[PDB]
Structures are given as structure tokens and as C-alpha cells.
Amino acid sequence: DDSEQLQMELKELALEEERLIQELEDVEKNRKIVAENLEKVQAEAERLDQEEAQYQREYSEFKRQQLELDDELKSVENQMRYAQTQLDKLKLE
């Protein structure tokens, strides 16, 4: 009866082995898929980093332009106030 028990056990184990092999193949498949997805999102994130860097540079540049133009406008305003003061004095004689 020993031999029959061993034969049955070997058939049971062969079924379990096949189950595990198919599980392993499934996990490997899914792993490759997820790795590809990781590669994709990482590349995407680098491109986004560069896009953000460009916008940040543009934003900072516009702020500096605002500062410069404000200074220029203040200058023009002062020049107008001065010219108008002189003109008013001349007109009043």
C-alpha cells in the first residue's frame, strides 16, 4: 500500500507544482507590466519637471520686468511733475 500512497502523492504534488508554476508566470507578467508603467511615469515626471522649470523662469523674469517698468514709470511721472511745475510758474509769471 506504500507504493500506491506514494503514487497518489506524486500526482497531487504534480498538480500543485503546475499551479505554482502558473502563478509564478502570472506574477512575472504583471511585474513586467508594472515596471513598464513605472518607466513611463518616471519619464513623464522628468518632462513635467522641465516644464515647471521653464514656467518658473518665465514667472521670475516677468516679476523682474515689473520692477524695472515700475521704476521707469516712476521716473517719467517725476519728470512730468517737474515740467508741469516749471510751466505753471512761467504761466503765472
Task: For residues 53 and 46, give the distance between their C-alpha atoms in angstroms, rounded to a whole number.
Answer: 11
Q: Which three cell numbers stand for residue 15?
A: 498538480
Task: For residues 72 and 76, give the distance between their C-alpha atoms in angstroms, rounded to a whole number.
Answer: 6
Q: Which three cell numbers stand for residue 11?
A: 500526482
The yes or no reply on residue 43 touching its own copies (CB under 8 A) is no
Minimum CB separation from its own copies for residue 14, in Å? 7
Task: For residues 72 and 65, give the distance between their C-alpha atoms in angstroms, rounded to a whole number.
Answer: 10
Contact residues toward its own copies (CB under 8 A) are 2-3, 6-7, 9-10, 13-14, 16-17, 20-21, 23-24, 27-28, 30-31, 34-35, 37-38, 41-42, 44-45, 48-49, 51-52, 55-56, 58-59, 62-63, 65-66, 69-70, 72-73, 76-77, 79-80, 83-84, 86-87, 90-91
